Amino acid sequence: SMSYTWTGALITPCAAEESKLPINALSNSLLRHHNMVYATTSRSAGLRQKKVTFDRLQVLDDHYRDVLKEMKAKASTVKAKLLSVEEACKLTPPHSAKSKFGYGAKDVRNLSSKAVNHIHSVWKDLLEDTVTPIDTTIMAKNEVFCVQRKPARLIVFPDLGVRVCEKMALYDVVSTLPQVVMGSSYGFQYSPGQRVEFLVNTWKSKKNPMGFSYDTRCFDSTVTENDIRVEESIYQCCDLAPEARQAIKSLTERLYIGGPLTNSKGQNCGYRRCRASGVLTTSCGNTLTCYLKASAACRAAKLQDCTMLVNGDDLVVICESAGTQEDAASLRVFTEAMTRYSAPPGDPPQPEYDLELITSCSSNVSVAHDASGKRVYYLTRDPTTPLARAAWETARHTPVNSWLGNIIMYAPTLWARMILMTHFFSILLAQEQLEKALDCQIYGACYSIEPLDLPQIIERLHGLSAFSLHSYSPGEINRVASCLRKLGVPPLRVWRHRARSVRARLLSQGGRAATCGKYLFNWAVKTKLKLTPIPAASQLDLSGWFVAGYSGGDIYH
Ligand SMILES: COc1ccc2c(c1)S(=O)(=O)NC(c1c(O)c(-c3ccccc3)nn(CCC(C)C)c1=O)=N2
Secondary structure (H helix, E strand, O other), X not given: OEOEEEOOOXXXXXXXXXXXXXXXXXXXXXXXXXXXXXXXXXHHHHHHHHHHOOEOOOOOOHHHHHHHHHHHHHHOOOEOOOOOHHHHHOOOOOOOOOOOOOOOHHHHHOOOHHHHHHHHHHHHXXXXXXXXXXXXXXXXXXXEEEOOOOOOOEEEEOOXXXXXXXXXXXXXXXXXXXXXXXXXXXXXXXXXXXXXXXXXXXXXXXXOEEEEXXXXXXXXXXXOHHHHHHHHHHHHOOEOOXXXXXXXXXXXXXXXXXXXXXXXXXXXXXXXXXXXXXXXOHHXXXXXXXXXXXXXXXXXXXXXXXXXXXXXXXXXXXXEOOOHHXXXXXXXXXXXXXXXXXXXXXXXOOOEOOHHHOOEOOEEEEEEEOOOOOEEEEEEOOOHHHHHHHHHHHHOOOOOOHHHHHHHHHOOOHHHHHHHHXXXXXXXXXXXXXXXXXXXXXXXXXXXXXXXXXXXXXHXXXXXXXXXXXXXXXXXXXXXXXXXXXXXXXXXXXXXXXXXXXXXXXXXXXXXXXXXXXXXXXHHOOOOOOOOOOHHHHHOOOOOOOOOOOOOOOEEO
């Protein structure tokens, strides 16, 4: 069937949207080429509608069913708990979109009786009714990039009351099942370093390693009614409370499979027969589905000792080469299979023979050296989007603070230590706002984070190594440098200078601020202070930071 059908009503915005980067007194210290940075808006959603709208054919064979049966056997070992209304309420982000039934995110969080009542009545309707399509809102995401212009991405989500019910029903499943079904292929169980560890061990466990990422064209749109029912039959394999079995079947029929789309104004826009981007099971379902399809395809294309790493719609395979000609021909077959399974490619896939060239989850493995001279592997990416967003966040307060997320996930990197950290700690000092907790996203989930805790976080996730890395590779250095010429970011000798000031200012405050100066900015000085383990390190509740994926699933931890 058709992924979408459209009545012709436009995708409308809530507030005014800004596409040109806002500029303040801090901007020029980061970025001169302001017109290179933009925010997508509802206004360009027609371009997106065009490309995500197509017909889907699907042809499922034995490799496909065999693997599905392998997955179900694992899922039948899983036991999920039905969350309480209160518990699901606590998992709602504070900035989550308000209900049309007259209550909001905070009324959910602080547990007001009006919100709890409506939620209960939504649950009860869910238990009694398994057919009635559930209303959803379609919006355009405001995201920020550098010119490469991309149309706004679409977000489709049900009402706040449904979103809470989803959590009651499925939060435990989507946190627990993916790991059991897909084992070490489940990308979201990994921190950055654990991911490098897995990619490196996988790579080097092959005689002659060949790897490739697979870029599906609009994964969401390629997901069919079949796919959604299949993944439901996977959820159903779990040991569940009778009320959870029921809610899951009903949410599958009324919501996950398809449903009407309403704009922010109340007008009807059309109908959806593919994955909704804004539901709880978005991450988990895409993952299970991508894995199911790629595992089968790898069999259909006779790939040798193939190892998969899956994150939502993001897929990378590492296997044994047969030479460039047989490798070239293996992937076309792999891609034909994926195509039959309704997962056609964007850019066709290309074999890589050097791990550092493999881009997956928008990151690559790279190498630098620790204080001992001991070669160390770490994860990095092209910093263009991180820096484009840092620019936006320099001038505008935002619901999610990506600069802080980028420091947590990309601490060992050159561009995150020398730029992100220097620039933003410089800003927090001027506002005296070091002690203030900020919101940031990790694998789709919102975390409230105190900047002063960064050293301990970084030590826990990356080891003291991360405060000592040096002699980065020429490929990494070049990309960072080339990215700065593009954006008009000051050269790295300026940031070193700024960082000496930023560090000394921090040392002066004493306490946590001086711990920040000592560890985050040790790189900046000629004669370095000695970095030992940190007393307060083993105090943070880092449980559930890298358990599962939650993107579009409206989750707060
Ligand atoms: C639609 O399916 C998805 C596919 C891929 C997804 C995600 C969803 S995600 O859960 O939004 N987060 C990430 C993700 C990040 O959010 C982030 C990230 C970046 C900056 C700030 C916070 C998180 N980083 N990486 C790379 C590092 C890890 C693979 C070790 C990511 O892959 N990737």
